[PDB]
Symmetry: C10
Subunit: 75 residues, 10 copies
C-alpha cells in the first residue's frame, strides 16, 4: 500500500499538465475578442457572448484534468 499511495501522488501531479491547454486556449479566445473588437467596435455585443462560450468549453478540458487530479489525491 506504500507504492500505491506513492503512485496516487505522482499521478495527481501528472494530471495537472493538461491544464496548460486551457491556459493557452482561454488566452487565444480572449485575444480574438480583443482583436475583433479593435477592428470592428460595433460587433462587441455580438462576439462577447461567443468569447464567454469559447472560454467555458476550453476551460472544461482543464476541469476534467483537475477532477482526475483530485480523484487521485482524495478519492
Amino acid at each position: 500500500m506504500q507504492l500505491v499511495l506513492a503512485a496516487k501522488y505522482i499521478g495527481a501531479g501528472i494530471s495537472t499538465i493538461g491544464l496548460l491547454g486551457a491556459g493557452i486556449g482561454i488566452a487565444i479566445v480572449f485575444a480574438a475578442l480583443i482583436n475583433g473588437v479593435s477592428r470592428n467596435p460595433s460587433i462587441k455585443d455580438t462576439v462577447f457572448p461567443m468569447a464567454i462560450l469559447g472560454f467555458a468549453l476550453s476551460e472544461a478540458t482543464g476541469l476534467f484534468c483537475l477532477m482526475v487530479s483530485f480523484l487521485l489525491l482524495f478519492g
Copy 2:
C-alpha cells in the same frame, strides 16, 4: 497486485495529458468564429454552426483520453 494498482493510477494521470489538445483546439475554433464575425457580421448564422461542429469534434479527442483515464481509475 500493488504494482498493478500503482500502474493504473500513474496511467490514469498520464491519460489526461492529451486533453491539452482539445483545450487549445476548442479555443482555435472560437477565435476563428470571433475574427470571422468581426470581419463579416452578416456571416454569423453560417459560421456559428461550423464553430459548434469544430468544437465538438475537437472535444471528442479529449473525451477519448478521459475514457482511458476512467477505465484505468475504475475499470
Copy 3:
C-alpha cells in the same frame, strides 16, 4: 506477470498523449473553414467537403493512438 500487466496500463496511458495532435488539428481545419467562408461566403459548398476530409484524416492519427491504447488495455 505483475510487471507486464503494470507496463500495459502505463503504456495504455502514454498511448493517449498523441490524441492532442488531432485535438489541435481538427480545430485548425475548422478555423480555416470559418475564416475562408467569412472572407468569401460563395465558396462554402466547395470548401466544406475539404474540411470534412481534412478533419477525418487528422482525427484518424489520434484514433490509431487510441487503437494501441485499447490493445494494451484489453489485449
Copy 4:
C-alpha cells in the same frame, strides 16, 4: 513512508509544468491588447477590461496547478 514522501516531492515538481500554459496565455492576451490598441487607439478603454478578464482566467489555470503542488508539498 519514505516512498510516499519521495512521491509527494516528485509530484510537486511535476505539478508546476502546467504553469507554462499561463505564462504563454497571459502573454497572448497582452499581445492582442497591444496590437489592438496600436491599430485603433480609441478602442483602448473598451478592450482593456477584456484583457484583464482574459489574463485572469488564463492565470487561474496555473494557480490550479500550484494548488496541487502546495497540497503535495505541505
Copy 5:
C-alpha cells in the same frame, strides 16, 4: 523476461506520441487548401493535388511511428 515484455509494451505506447505530428501537419495542409481556395477559387484544381501530396508526406511520419509500435507489440 517480465522485464523485456514490459519494455515492449511501454515502448509501444511511447511510439505513438509522434503521431501528434501528422495530426497537426495534415490539418495545416488542409487549412492552407481551404484558405487558398477561398481567396482564389480558380486555383482549386492546381492546389488540391498539392494538398493530397502534403497530406501523404506528413501522414508517412505517423506511419513510421505506428510501424515501430507494431514491431514492439507483435514483432
Copy 6:
C-alpha cells in the same frame, strides 16, 4: 532517506520546465510592443506600460516555478 533526498533533487529539476512558458510569453509581449510601435509610432507611450505589465504577469508564472524548485532544493 536516500529516496527522499533523491526525490527533492529530481523534483527541483522538473520544477524548472515551466519556466519555458515565461521565456516564450515575455517574448510574445515584447514582439507585440515592437510591431505595435513600428505600425503606429505615436502609440509608444500608451503601449509601453502595457508591455511592462504583460511581462511582469508572464514572469510571475516563472517565479512560482522557481519558488517550488528552491523549496525542494533548500526548503
Copy 7:
C-alpha cells in the same frame, strides 16, 4: 542481458517522438506552397522545387530519429 534488451526497446520507442517535427514541418512547407501559389499562380514552377527541397530536408530529421530507432531494435 534482459535489462539491456529492455532498454533497447524503450529507447526505440522514445526515438520515434522526434518524427513529430517532420510531420509538422513537411506540412508547414506545403502550406506555404499552397498559399504562395493561390496568391500568385504564375510563381508555381519557381517555388515547387523550393518546396521539394524544404520538405526533403525537414523529413530527413525524422529519418535520423528512425535510424536510431532501427539501430536499437535490430
Copy 8:
C-alpha cells in the same frame, strides 16, 4: 549517497529543458524587430532598445533553469 548523486545528475539534465523557452522567445523578439524595421525603417532606433530589453528578460528565464542545473551538478 549513490542514489542521491544519481538523482542530482538526472535532475541537472531535466533542468535544461526549460531553456527551449528562451531559445524560441529570443527569436520571437528578433523576428518582430526585423519585421517592424522592414515595414518602417525610420523606427529602428526606437525599437532596437526594446528588442534588447525583451531578449534579455526572455533569456534570463533560461538562465534560472541553468542556475538550478549547475546547483544540482556542482552543489
Copy 9:
C-alpha cells in the same frame, strides 16, 4: 555494467527528441522562402542564399543532438 549499458541505450533514444526542432525549423525557413518569392519574384536570388544559411544553422542544432546520440550508442 548492465545498468550502464541500459542507460546508454535509453539516453541515445532520448537524445533524438531535440531533432524535432530542426524538423519544424527547417520547414519554417523554407516556408518563408516560398512566401517571400511568391510575393516578390524578383527577390529570389537575394533570399535563396539566406534560406540556405537559415537551414544550415537550424540543422546544426539537430546535428548536436545526433552527435550525443551516437556518442551514447557507440562512444
Copy 10:
C-alpha cells in the same frame, strides 16, 4: 558507481532536448529576415545583422544545454 554512471548518461540525453528551442528559434529569425527583405529589399543591409544577432543569441541557449550534456558525458 553503476547507478551514478547510468544517471550521467540518461542525464546527458535529457540535456539535449532543450536544443529544439534554438532549432525552432534560429528558423523564426531567418523567416523574418526573408519576409522582411521580400517586402522591402532596400532594408537588407539593416536587417541582416539583426538576423545574425538573433540567431547567435538563440543558438546560445542550445549551447548551454550542450554544455551540461558534455559535462555529464565527460566531466
